[PDB]
Design a protein around this ligand. Sequence first.
Ligand SMILES: [Cl-]
Ligand SMILES: [Cl-]
Lengths: 214, 214
Amino acid sequence: AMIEPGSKLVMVGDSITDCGRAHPVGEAPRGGLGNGYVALVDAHLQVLHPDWRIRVVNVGTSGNTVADVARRWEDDVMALQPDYVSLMIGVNDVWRQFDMPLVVERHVGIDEYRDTLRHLVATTKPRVREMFLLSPFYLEPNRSDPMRKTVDAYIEAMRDVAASEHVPFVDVQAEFDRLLAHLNTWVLAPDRVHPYLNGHLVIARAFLTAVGVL
Amino acid sequence: AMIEPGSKLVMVGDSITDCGRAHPVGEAPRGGLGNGYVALVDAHLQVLHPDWRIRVVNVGTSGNTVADVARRWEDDVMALQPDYVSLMIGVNDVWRQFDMPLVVERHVGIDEYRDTLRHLVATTKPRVREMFLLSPFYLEPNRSDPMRKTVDAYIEAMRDVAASEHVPFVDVQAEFDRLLAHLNTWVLAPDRVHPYLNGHLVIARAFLTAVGVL
Ligand SMILES: [Cl-]
Ligand SMILES: [Cl-]
């Protein structure tokens, strides 16, 4: 799943991608990528593969569902002329159903989620070298917890789109499940959703492994 | 030079180590370790070796020379009953000679630096499983630059103290020199001294390699 030298990699998502990145566009120099997994991906590429000249860009936005991502996709993502795009999205699409159950217009149901991911992949894939779908995740080891069960269904929908569109799927949730057998969720996040540096390192390493750097 | 499971590792130094860590003592939970190499060391230990149960602690203090470290050693470092101690120090000892050349009581010359390091190792080694000396560094590839030449001399004084006491020496400066052949210093720091995340990852990986994790 190699990243060609001299390429621009645009990483898209919600707050976990955002991590305080610069506006309108987060770039590597200084701290413009924020302080989470996107900044860690860039740091590993520059420290281990500086000659690859990979330009990493962050356009994550806190609170986004896949509907928000789709609305801004051409202007915020494709206008940057990416060679590679990654997308992690879905935790908010599910979370709103639990933290705002009566505020139904904030919810994105699974059919809208799957259809919107399919459209984004279908329009993006012909214009990039590769697109990477990164699973949303929820740091709850009990897969019968209702929200965890719903997140797993959305992850499956993403996996199915990745398979049907033939783009790579990075199962970040599976990496957390392995780690949660050793560490309890409070070590990784204050709220099962937004990880500390440790969980951002899990995401970055999963992505870097998917692109053959680790 | 492995770290035995269930051990407390206290990391000491100047702002490079500090990185906004919590007072009076920086601990892992949340962001108490700051947002630099000490936090990255802890993150890798917990993600890759959670069963090791390594408690990482940060007592770095911005602006410290080795004289400042020695003054607070017993109360800030040894009182924590460390199993392992790391120390990176020296860049300020040198830098003050250049940024405040006439303010001589802020300078620490090489004989004082060497003798103070000797004393810190001598007093610590019998009380810990292992101590690690981490080179200070200066992100200037021209070895003839006067400050870079002086930093190199202090690094070699530290290396010689480590060899005399038979404690591990981690040559962080050498890892930066290799990377500086590929990336210019402005990619790594705004001032040749305080690195961005990329440089903190260089330091963390050098430490982790020295303890057998990478
Ligand atoms: Cl495992
Ligand atoms: Cl090399």
